[PDB]
Each structure stands twice: as C-alpha cells, then as structure tokens.
Amino acid sequence: KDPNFVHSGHGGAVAGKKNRTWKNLKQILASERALPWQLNDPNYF
DNA sequence: CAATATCCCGAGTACATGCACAGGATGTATATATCTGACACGTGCCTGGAGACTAGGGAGTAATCCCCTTGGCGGTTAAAACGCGGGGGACAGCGCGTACGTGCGTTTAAGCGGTGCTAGAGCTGTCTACGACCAATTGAGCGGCCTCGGCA
Question: Signal sequence span per UniProt?
C-alpha cells in the first residue's frame, strides 16, 4: 500500500545532543565554503 | 469630693494546635579516591630596634566679652470634645497565571596545543609639580584741607 516503511537514517539527532532535525541553512553554507571552488563557478553564497 | 477611666474577674466561645497516620525521598553506609594542603623545610625582609638633633607643636597663661544662659516676654494655636459623613467592612463568582510536566537542543566544561599579552623589570630619563620667592591689588583707617547750625 504505502511507498515504504523501512526508512533510512539520513542524519537526525538520534546519536547525540546536537540540533534536532538537521543543521540550519547558515551551518550548511559554512560547510559549502570549504569546497575547491574556482573563480567562474556559480554558487548559492 | 465627683466623675471618667483603667483594672479585674468569670461565662461563654471556634478553632488551633498538637497529635496520629501513610508513605516517600534522602540520609545513611561502604568502598574508592586523589589530591588539598599539612607539614615540613629553608629565604630573605621588614618590623623593629636604637641615636642625635632640630623646630614644631604643645602646654601654659592672661585678659575678656561673646555667647550662652535665663527670665520674662506677648501671641497664637494643637488639644478637647462634640457633632456629623461617608467609607472601610463582610459575601457571591471568572478565568487568568502559575505551576508543572514534556521534550524541548544551546551551550559549557574539559582537555587539546600554540603564542602573545602583561606585568615586572630600568636608573629607564627626565620635568610636572613642588616649593621659593617675588610682585599687585584691594581695603581700611588716619591725617588733613574745606560749609554750615546753633549760640553770644
């Protein structure tokens, strides 16, 4: 009936005290600024 | 002496208190723990002692009238007591906050290595501030010149 029930653990706060569902957008972006971008590349920031 | 008042004693009066009860949360109890700091050891400083001397101050006195102190002052209200007004006092209910419980997830503490901020260094090296002295100013009091009011 329903599409699925054995849903995967994508990243929620089961394993520790950290923020509940997932990182906020600012924290995501702080991890995107680490990548090997080059001077012509489109981006979100 | 009369009068308003405080004091005192017994009847009658709700509930307050001290108690008994169920039960729950925490104080105990044991074992373990490192580490606070106790204790022991010297380090080196100032707290103290101890002298010589001036000059600042302190103590003393003398003279005295300022200020306090007192009496007697004249003037007006806080108190006394009453009349007199409204206002502090005793019940019915709403629902809003406070509490309290749930699951909310933010941040701190800790232990990590790196490093630059600060706080003890100088004779730093001077020179603001510290006396030292001079000079200006105002004010006050004392002489001295000059119109006029009461007296011969």
Answer: none
Q: In the numeric block, which tokens belong to residue A15?
A: 């394993």
Distance of CA A9 to the CA centre of its chain: 13
| Contact indicator for A32, A45 with CB cutoff of 8 Å | yes
Lookup: tokens for A2: 């329903």
Query: From the CA of A26, how many Å to the C1' of B139?
Result: 83
Experiment type: cryo-EM
A12 CA vs B66 C1’ separation (Å) = 96
**What's the Rg (C-alpha) of chain A?**
16
CA distances (Å), A19 to each of A33, A39, A42, in order? Answer: 21, 33, 29
